[PDB]
Amino acid sequence: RDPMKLAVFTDSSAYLSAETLQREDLFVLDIPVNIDGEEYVEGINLSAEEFYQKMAQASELPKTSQPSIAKLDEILTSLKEQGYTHALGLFLSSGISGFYQSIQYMVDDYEGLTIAFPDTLITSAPLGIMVESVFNWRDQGDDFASIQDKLAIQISRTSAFIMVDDLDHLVKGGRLSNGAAILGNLLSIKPILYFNDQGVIEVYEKVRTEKKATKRLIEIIKETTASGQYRVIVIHGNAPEKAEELRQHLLDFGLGSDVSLATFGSVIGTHLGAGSIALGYIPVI
Ligand SMILES: CCCCCCCCCCCCCC(=O)O
Ligand code: NA
């Protein structure tokens, strides 16, 4: 491996594989979720499996907070003092959190520590695979500049396509424009949303029904992944039967172990609400 002494950061909106969660020098900044005046951190005092029902019994909509910039600063200061030479931070999209813009002033603040915080434009399982890939590339002997190049390609060719049971959480949480709600009919319509090339959640297509929207997610992913080898992830929030159906369609298309399943927990589920489904994709670089 390269003789840099590298630290990798992400936040808990990333869906991290068991592989990645074992890796050295990985720092995950937790995102707290306020429910009825109490602060929860998934994996500490909140399990992902209790979240949707807990939210349904809440007296106001839960609210997420940004990853802690104070803890990022303290960790970076510490890593500098312990002789680390490089830090890579892969955080949730600038289009869904002010955290990315807030940390841009820190990049040059730590003498002797080379820092990069590229805008990943994504979250959830694709973000987690970016983190995984960083370690894979390190294991190939890649240095810091080569890792950044490879990340830049992944970022440019990654997105996710999303359908929610109801647009209320997204609009009320602020990550989807207010207009989008009147954009479209009512209960029945199931718009497909995606991460656009600015990392912002945008309406892709207004679909009339859930059954069609399910098919359309598959058809869109067949198109967007046609050039090369991609990881495709079926991601759901309390929608396991729909997720398994989609996974079966992708396996029948031939995706094999390149298709996997993940879940939306408390952080993303606060914004998407229960009953949500997404297909994420990211090239294997
Ligand atoms: C793959 C689909 C992902 C959908 C993401 C919905 C929006 C999540 C925003 C989470 C913000 C957490 C940190 C914050 O509050 O600033
Ligand atoms: Na392909």
mmCIF file of C-alpha atoms and ligand atoms in Angstrom:
data_model
loop_
_atom_site.group_PDB
_atom_site.id
_atom_site.type_symbol
_atom_site.label_atom_id
_atom_site.label_comp_id
_atom_site.label_asym_id
_atom_site.label_seq_id
_atom_site.Cartn_x
_atom_site.Cartn_y
_atom_site.Cartn_z
ATOM 1 C CA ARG A 1 0.000 0.000 0.000
ATOM 2 C CA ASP A 2 0.937 3.709 -0.341
ATOM 3 C CA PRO A 3 2.841 5.125 2.725
ATOM 4 C CA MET A 4 0.292 7.809 3.388
ATOM 5 C CA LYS A 5 -1.421 7.506 6.721
ATOM 6 C CA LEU A 6 -5.040 7.930 5.634
ATOM 7 C CA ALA A 7 -8.244 8.542 7.555
ATOM 8 C CA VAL A 8 -11.616 8.092 5.830
ATOM 9 C CA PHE A 9 -14.754 9.888 7.059
ATOM 10 C CA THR A 10 -18.426 9.429 6.254
ATOM 11 C CA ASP A 11 -21.734 10.031 7.987
ATOM 12 C CA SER A 12 -24.443 7.674 9.163
ATOM 13 C CA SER A 13 -26.704 8.444 6.227
ATOM 14 C CA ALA A 14 -24.332 6.143 4.319
ATOM 15 C CA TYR A 15 -25.519 2.503 4.251
ATOM 16 C CA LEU A 16 -22.319 0.683 5.109
ATOM 17 C CA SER A 17 -21.595 -2.924 4.344
ATOM 18 C CA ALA A 18 -20.293 -5.299 6.946
ATOM 19 C CA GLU A 19 -16.985 -5.308 4.986
ATOM 20 C CA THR A 20 -16.617 -1.540 5.325
ATOM 21 C CA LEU A 21 -17.625 -1.393 8.975
ATOM 22 C CA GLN A 22 -14.563 -3.555 9.804
ATOM 23 C CA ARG A 23 -12.077 -1.313 7.993
ATOM 24 C CA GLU A 24 -9.200 0.565 9.605
ATOM 25 C CA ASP A 25 -9.222 4.348 10.164
ATOM 26 C CA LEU A 26 -12.884 4.762 9.247
ATOM 27 C CA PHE A 27 -14.716 7.521 11.131
ATOM 28 C CA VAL A 28 -18.494 7.662 10.823
ATOM 29 C CA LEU A 29 -20.111 10.900 12.038
ATOM 30 C CA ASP A 30 -23.495 10.087 13.503
ATOM 31 C CA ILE A 31 -26.615 11.992 12.446
ATOM 32 C CA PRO A 32 -28.972 12.420 15.404
ATOM 33 C CA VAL A 33 -32.705 12.202 14.960
ATOM 34 C CA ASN A 34 -34.935 14.241 17.315
ATOM 35 C CA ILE A 35 -38.233 12.510 18.150
ATOM 36 C CA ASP A 36 -40.577 14.317 20.541
ATOM 37 C CA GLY A 37 -37.826 16.316 22.173
ATOM 38 C CA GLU A 38 -35.374 13.456 22.670
ATOM 39 C CA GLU A 39 -32.240 12.892 20.610
ATOM 40 C CA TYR A 40 -31.585 9.428 19.168
ATOM 41 C CA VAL A 41 -28.566 7.985 17.372
ATOM 42 C CA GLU A 42 -29.151 4.807 15.406
ATOM 43 C CA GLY A 43 -27.102 1.939 16.751
ATOM 44 C CA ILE A 44 -26.727 3.594 20.151
ATOM 45 C CA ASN A 45 -30.217 4.160 21.544
ATOM 46 C CA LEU A 46 -32.394 3.569 18.486
ATOM 47 C CA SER A 47 -32.526 0.498 16.285
ATOM 48 C CA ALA A 48 -33.421 0.795 12.647
ATOM 49 C CA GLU A 49 -36.101 -1.862 13.165
ATOM 50 C CA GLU A 50 -38.057 0.234 15.659
ATOM 51 C CA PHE A 51 -37.868 3.506 13.725
ATOM 52 C CA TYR A 52 -40.965 3.507 11.507
ATOM 53 C CA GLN A 53 -43.382 2.552 14.222
ATOM 54 C CA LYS A 54 -41.681 4.913 16.633
ATOM 55 C CA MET A 55 -42.123 7.723 14.129
ATOM 56 C CA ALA A 56 -45.802 6.755 13.661
ATOM 57 C CA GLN A 57 -46.389 7.070 17.422
ATOM 58 C CA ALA A 58 -44.548 10.460 17.590
ATOM 59 C CA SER A 59 -46.406 13.688 18.300
ATOM 60 C CA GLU A 60 -44.556 15.680 15.611
ATOM 61 C CA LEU A 61 -42.506 14.716 12.619
ATOM 62 C CA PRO A 62 -38.906 13.696 13.579
ATOM 63 C CA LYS A 63 -36.138 16.088 12.595
ATOM 64 C CA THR A 64 -32.633 15.171 11.598
ATOM 65 C CA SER A 65 -29.534 17.198 12.487
ATOM 66 C CA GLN A 66 -26.353 17.605 10.479
ATOM 67 C CA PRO A 67 -23.322 15.431 11.271
ATOM 68 C CA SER A 68 -21.329 17.278 13.935
ATOM 69 C CA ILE A 69 -18.781 19.700 12.489
ATOM 70 C CA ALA A 70 -17.348 20.094 16.025
ATOM 71 C CA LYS A 71 -16.555 16.381 16.162
ATOM 72 C CA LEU A 72 -15.109 16.474 12.655
ATOM 73 C CA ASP A 73 -12.819 19.319 13.758
ATOM 74 C CA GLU A 74 -11.742 17.540 16.956
ATOM 75 C CA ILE A 75 -11.026 14.296 15.117
ATOM 76 C CA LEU A 76 -9.056 16.037 12.368
ATOM 77 C CA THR A 77 -7.020 17.940 15.005
ATOM 78 C CA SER A 78 -6.305 14.637 16.767
ATOM 79 C CA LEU A 79 -5.374 12.755 13.539
ATOM 80 C CA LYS A 80 -2.962 15.570 12.656
ATOM 81 C CA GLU A 81 -1.357 15.289 16.084
ATOM 82 C CA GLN A 82 -1.081 11.501 15.632
ATOM 83 C CA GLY A 83 0.825 11.770 12.374
ATOM 84 C CA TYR A 84 -1.928 11.087 9.833
ATOM 85 C CA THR A 85 -1.096 12.598 6.458
ATOM 86 C CA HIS A 86 -4.368 12.450 4.502
ATOM 87 C CA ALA A 87 -8.109 12.587 5.194
ATOM 88 C CA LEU A 88 -10.895 11.870 2.765
ATOM 89 C CA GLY A 89 -14.457 12.834 3.704
ATOM 90 C CA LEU A 90 -17.382 11.313 1.762
ATOM 91 C CA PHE A 91 -20.568 12.888 3.125
ATOM 92 C CA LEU A 92 -24.174 13.139 2.083
ATOM 93 C CA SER A 93 -25.069 15.332 -0.920
ATOM 94 C CA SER A 94 -24.893 19.101 -0.710
ATOM 95 C CA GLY A 95 -28.385 18.970 -2.185
ATOM 96 C CA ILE A 96 -29.869 17.358 0.928
ATOM 97 C CA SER A 97 -27.888 18.864 3.810
ATOM 98 C CA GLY A 98 -25.936 22.039 4.535
ATOM 99 C CA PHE A 99 -23.152 19.955 6.036
ATOM 100 C CA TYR A 100 -21.066 19.766 2.797
ATOM 101 C CA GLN A 101 -20.926 23.542 2.303
ATOM 102 C CA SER A 102 -20.174 24.081 5.995
ATOM 103 C CA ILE A 103 -17.058 21.936 6.029
ATOM 104 C CA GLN A 104 -15.452 23.527 2.928
ATOM 105 C CA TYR A 105 -13.572 26.058 5.046
ATOM 106 C CA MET A 106 -11.794 23.216 6.957
ATOM 107 C CA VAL A 107 -10.047 21.654 3.963
ATOM 108 C CA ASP A 108 -6.909 23.796 4.401
ATOM 109 C CA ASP A 109 -7.031 24.255 8.189
ATOM 110 C CA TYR A 110 -4.787 21.401 9.407
ATOM 111 C CA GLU A 111 -1.088 21.815 8.828
ATOM 112 C CA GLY A 112 0.479 18.586 7.556
ATOM 113 C CA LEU A 113 -2.876 16.965 6.801
ATOM 114 C CA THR A 114 -3.995 16.793 3.128
ATOM 115 C CA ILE A 115 -7.820 16.837 3.076
ATOM 116 C CA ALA A 116 -10.353 16.273 0.330
ATOM 117 C CA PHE A 117 -14.112 16.593 0.705
ATOM 118 C CA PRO A 118 -15.595 15.945 -2.752
ATOM 119 C CA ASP A 119 -19.352 16.475 -3.145
ATOM 120 C CA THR A 120 -20.694 12.942 -3.469
ATOM 121 C CA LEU A 121 -24.155 14.116 -4.687
ATOM 122 C CA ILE A 122 -25.691 11.047 -3.029
ATOM 123 C CA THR A 123 -26.390 9.183 0.238
ATOM 124 C CA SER A 124 -27.491 5.730 1.444
ATOM 125 C CA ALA A 125 -26.115 2.602 -0.295
ATOM 126 C CA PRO A 126 -24.305 4.328 -3.239
ATOM 127 C CA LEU A 127 -22.495 6.588 -0.719
ATOM 128 C CA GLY A 128 -21.599 3.516 1.322
ATOM 129 C CA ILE A 129 -20.180 1.813 -1.774
ATOM 130 C CA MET A 130 -18.041 4.911 -2.445
ATOM 131 C CA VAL A 131 -16.570 4.440 1.035
ATOM 132 C CA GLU A 132 -16.114 0.709 0.399
ATOM 133 C CA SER A 133 -14.421 1.457 -2.919
ATOM 134 C CA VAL A 134 -11.953 3.816 -1.245
ATOM 135 C CA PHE A 135 -10.678 0.936 0.845
ATOM 136 C CA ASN A 136 -10.648 -1.407 -2.144
ATOM 137 C CA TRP A 137 -8.515 1.072 -4.104
ATOM 138 C CA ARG A 138 -6.208 1.631 -1.153
ATOM 139 C CA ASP A 139 -5.717 -2.120 -1.054
ATOM 140 C CA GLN A 140 -4.721 -1.937 -4.754
ATOM 141 C CA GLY A 141 -1.908 0.473 -3.747
ATOM 142 C CA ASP A 142 -3.695 3.572 -5.035
ATOM 143 C CA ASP A 143 -2.466 6.836 -3.668
ATOM 144 C CA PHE A 144 -4.622 9.783 -2.606
ATOM 145 C CA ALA A 145 -4.746 11.438 -6.044
ATOM 146 C CA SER A 146 -5.697 8.179 -7.819
ATOM 147 C CA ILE A 147 -8.463 7.531 -5.263
ATOM 148 C CA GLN A 148 -9.856 11.008 -5.899
ATOM 149 C CA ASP A 149 -9.897 10.429 -9.653
ATOM 150 C CA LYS A 150 -11.760 7.163 -9.254
ATOM 151 C CA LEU A 151 -14.247 8.748 -6.865
ATOM 152 C CA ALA A 152 -14.856 11.505 -9.402
ATOM 153 C CA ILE A 153 -15.841 8.950 -12.018
ATOM 154 C CA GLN A 154 -18.172 7.150 -9.623
ATOM 155 C CA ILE A 155 -19.752 10.403 -8.505
ATOM 156 C CA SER A 156 -20.413 11.431 -12.092
ATOM 157 C CA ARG A 157 -22.145 8.124 -12.955
ATOM 158 C CA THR A 158 -24.117 7.438 -9.722
ATOM 159 C CA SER A 159 -27.667 8.322 -8.816
ATOM 160 C CA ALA A 160 -30.767 6.746 -7.267
ATOM 161 C CA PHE A 161 -34.399 6.602 -8.375
ATOM 162 C CA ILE A 162 -37.043 6.801 -5.643
ATOM 163 C CA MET A 163 -40.747 6.276 -5.058
ATOM 164 C CA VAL A 164 -42.423 7.099 -1.752
ATOM 165 C CA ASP A 165 -45.790 6.115 -0.351
ATOM 166 C CA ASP A 166 -46.513 9.752 0.353
ATOM 167 C CA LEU A 167 -44.702 12.966 -0.442
ATOM 168 C CA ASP A 168 -45.573 14.570 2.975
ATOM 169 C CA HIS A 169 -42.325 13.668 4.785
ATOM 170 C CA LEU A 170 -40.168 14.799 1.935
ATOM 171 C CA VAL A 171 -41.879 18.123 1.490
ATOM 172 C CA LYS A 172 -42.158 18.781 5.231
ATOM 173 C CA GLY A 173 -38.530 17.764 5.811
ATOM 174 C CA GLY A 174 -37.547 20.331 3.147
ATOM 175 C CA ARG A 175 -35.568 18.172 0.661
ATOM 176 C CA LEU A 176 -38.244 18.302 -2.058
ATOM 177 C CA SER A 177 -39.561 21.656 -3.304
ATOM 178 C CA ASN A 178 -43.012 22.683 -2.066
ATOM 179 C CA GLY A 179 -44.292 22.945 -5.652
ATOM 180 C CA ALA A 180 -43.623 19.277 -6.348
ATOM 181 C CA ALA A 181 -46.640 18.389 -4.197
ATOM 182 C CA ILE A 182 -49.199 20.115 -6.412
ATOM 183 C CA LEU A 183 -47.046 18.869 -9.292
ATOM 184 C CA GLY A 184 -49.059 15.690 -9.694
ATOM 185 C CA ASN A 185 -52.525 14.322 -8.863
ATOM 186 C CA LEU A 186 -53.128 13.027 -5.355
ATOM 187 C CA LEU A 187 -52.967 9.809 -3.341
ATOM 188 C CA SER A 188 -52.773 7.395 -6.272
ATOM 189 C CA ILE A 189 -49.983 9.003 -8.297
ATOM 190 C CA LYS A 190 -46.508 7.748 -7.574
ATOM 191 C CA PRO A 191 -43.886 10.113 -9.004
ATOM 192 C CA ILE A 192 -40.420 8.870 -9.459
ATOM 193 C CA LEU A 193 -37.797 11.142 -7.926
ATOM 194 C CA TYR A 194 -34.047 11.012 -8.540
ATOM 195 C CA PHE A 195 -30.804 12.709 -7.614
ATOM 196 C CA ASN A 196 -30.052 15.170 -10.355
ATOM 197 C CA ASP A 197 -26.591 16.226 -11.495
ATOM 198 C CA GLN A 198 -26.457 18.853 -8.724
ATOM 199 C CA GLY A 199 -27.222 16.205 -6.073
ATOM 200 C CA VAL A 200 -30.738 17.607 -5.530
ATOM 201 C CA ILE A 201 -33.882 15.467 -5.324
ATOM 202 C CA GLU A 202 -35.967 16.226 -8.414
ATOM 203 C CA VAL A 203 -39.087 14.782 -10.057
ATOM 204 C CA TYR A 204 -37.967 12.431 -12.852
ATOM 205 C CA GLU A 205 -41.349 11.246 -14.126
ATOM 206 C CA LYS A 206 -44.914 11.562 -12.861
ATOM 207 C CA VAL A 207 -46.221 7.925 -12.943
ATOM 208 C CA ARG A 208 -49.909 7.177 -12.481
ATOM 209 C CA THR A 209 -49.661 4.094 -10.187
ATOM 210 C CA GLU A 210 -47.310 2.134 -7.927
ATOM 211 C CA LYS A 211 -47.332 -0.943 -10.125
ATOM 212 C CA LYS A 212 -46.205 1.068 -13.104
ATOM 213 C CA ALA A 213 -43.656 3.015 -11.036
ATOM 214 C CA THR A 214 -42.112 -0.322 -9.933
ATOM 215 C CA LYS A 215 -41.646 -1.449 -13.520
ATOM 216 C CA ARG A 216 -40.369 1.999 -14.539
ATOM 217 C CA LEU A 217 -37.621 1.927 -11.884
ATOM 218 C CA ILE A 218 -36.373 -1.315 -13.424
ATOM 219 C CA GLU A 219 -36.586 -0.001 -16.936
ATOM 220 C CA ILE A 220 -34.714 3.173 -16.015
ATOM 221 C CA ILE A 221 -31.925 1.196 -14.322
ATOM 222 C CA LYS A 222 -31.608 -1.077 -17.394
ATOM 223 C CA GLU A 223 -30.931 2.117 -19.370
ATOM 224 C CA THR A 224 -28.612 3.925 -16.960
ATOM 225 C CA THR A 225 -26.399 0.923 -16.277
ATOM 226 C CA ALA A 226 -26.059 -0.350 -19.831
ATOM 227 C CA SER A 227 -22.504 0.951 -20.442
ATOM 228 C CA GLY A 228 -20.514 -0.974 -17.844
ATOM 229 C CA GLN A 229 -20.426 -2.999 -14.634
ATOM 230 C CA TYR A 230 -22.604 -1.388 -11.938
ATOM 231 C CA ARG A 231 -23.665 -2.213 -8.422
ATOM 232 C CA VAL A 232 -27.450 -1.821 -8.208
ATOM 233 C CA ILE A 233 -28.997 -1.660 -4.764
ATOM 234 C CA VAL A 234 -32.674 -2.145 -3.964
ATOM 235 C CA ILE A 235 -33.290 0.098 -0.919
ATOM 236 C CA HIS A 236 -36.504 0.176 1.059
ATOM 237 C CA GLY A 237 -38.068 1.665 4.181
ATOM 238 C CA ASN A 238 -40.606 -0.802 5.513
ATOM 239 C CA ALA A 239 -41.339 -2.120 2.007
ATOM 240 C CA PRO A 240 -39.684 -5.574 1.958
ATOM 241 C CA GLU A 241 -42.146 -7.366 -0.360
ATOM 242 C CA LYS A 242 -41.810 -4.637 -3.005
ATOM 243 C CA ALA A 243 -38.041 -4.644 -2.536
ATOM 244 C CA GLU A 244 -37.804 -8.405 -3.057
ATOM 245 C CA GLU A 245 -39.964 -8.171 -6.212
ATOM 246 C CA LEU A 246 -37.602 -5.562 -7.663
ATOM 247 C CA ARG A 247 -34.566 -7.577 -6.703
ATOM 248 C CA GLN A 248 -36.036 -10.602 -8.482
ATOM 249 C CA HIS A 249 -36.589 -8.520 -11.670
ATOM 250 C CA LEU A 250 -32.963 -7.378 -11.551
ATOM 251 C CA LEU A 251 -31.698 -10.903 -10.953
ATOM 252 C CA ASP A 252 -33.754 -12.107 -13.926
ATOM 253 C CA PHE A 253 -32.214 -9.359 -16.030
ATOM 254 C CA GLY A 254 -28.825 -10.927 -15.164
ATOM 255 C CA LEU A 255 -27.411 -8.639 -12.462
ATOM 256 C CA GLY A 256 -26.299 -11.511 -10.186
ATOM 257 C CA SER A 257 -24.378 -10.592 -7.114
ATOM 258 C CA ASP A 258 -24.105 -7.090 -8.437
ATOM 259 C CA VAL A 259 -27.618 -6.478 -7.061
ATOM 260 C CA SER A 260 -28.090 -6.234 -3.335
ATOM 261 C CA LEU A 261 -30.679 -5.091 -0.786
ATOM 262 C CA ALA A 262 -30.367 -2.322 1.795
ATOM 263 C CA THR A 263 -32.687 -0.352 4.044
ATOM 264 C CA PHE A 264 -33.533 3.213 4.894
ATOM 265 C CA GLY A 265 -33.154 3.727 8.637
ATOM 266 C CA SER A 266 -33.932 6.656 10.918
ATOM 267 C CA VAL A 267 -31.965 9.327 9.040
ATOM 268 C CA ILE A 268 -33.344 8.853 5.544
ATOM 269 C CA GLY A 269 -36.634 7.364 6.725
ATOM 270 C CA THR A 270 -37.395 10.620 8.559
ATOM 271 C CA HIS A 271 -37.479 12.331 5.127
ATOM 272 C CA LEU A 272 -38.915 9.551 2.890
ATOM 273 C CA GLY A 273 -41.446 8.107 5.360
ATOM 274 C CA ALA A 274 -42.462 4.463 5.611
ATOM 275 C CA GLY A 275 -43.227 2.475 2.511
ATOM 276 C CA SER A 276 -40.456 3.929 0.418
ATOM 277 C CA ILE A 277 -38.388 2.207 -2.287
ATOM 278 C CA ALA A 278 -35.317 3.241 -4.302
ATOM 279 C CA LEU A 279 -32.936 1.709 -6.824
ATOM 280 C CA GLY A 280 -29.412 3.071 -6.390
ATOM 281 C CA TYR A 281 -26.598 2.465 -8.859
ATOM 282 C CA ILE A 282 -22.851 3.116 -8.984
ATOM 283 C CA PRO A 283 -20.194 1.904 -11.405
ATOM 284 C CA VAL A 284 -17.607 -0.634 -10.331
ATOM 285 C CA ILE A 285 -14.357 1.218 -10.924
HETATM 286 C C1 LIG B 1 -31.513 6.948 -2.024
HETATM 287 C C2 LIG B 1 -32.625 7.936 -1.600
HETATM 288 C C3 LIG B 1 -32.186 8.972 -0.515
HETATM 289 C C4 LIG B 1 -33.255 9.996 -0.130
HETATM 290 C C5 LIG B 1 -32.701 11.075 0.844
HETATM 291 C C6 LIG B 1 -33.842 11.917 1.460
HETATM 292 C C7 LIG B 1 -33.325 13.130 2.263
HETATM 293 C C8 LIG B 1 -32.432 12.745 3.485
HETATM 294 C C9 LIG B 1 -31.814 14.013 4.111
HETATM 295 C C10 LIG B 1 -31.079 13.643 5.405
HETATM 296 C C11 LIG B 1 -30.450 14.893 6.095
HETATM 297 C C12 LIG B 1 -29.649 14.436 7.341
HETATM 298 C C13 LIG B 1 -28.671 15.486 7.872
HETATM 299 C C14 LIG B 1 -29.349 16.810 8.016
HETATM 300 O O1 LIG B 1 -30.404 16.953 8.707
HETATM 301 O O2 LIG B 1 -28.854 17.853 7.518
HETATM 302 NA NA NA B 2 -24.375 -2.883 -17.360
#
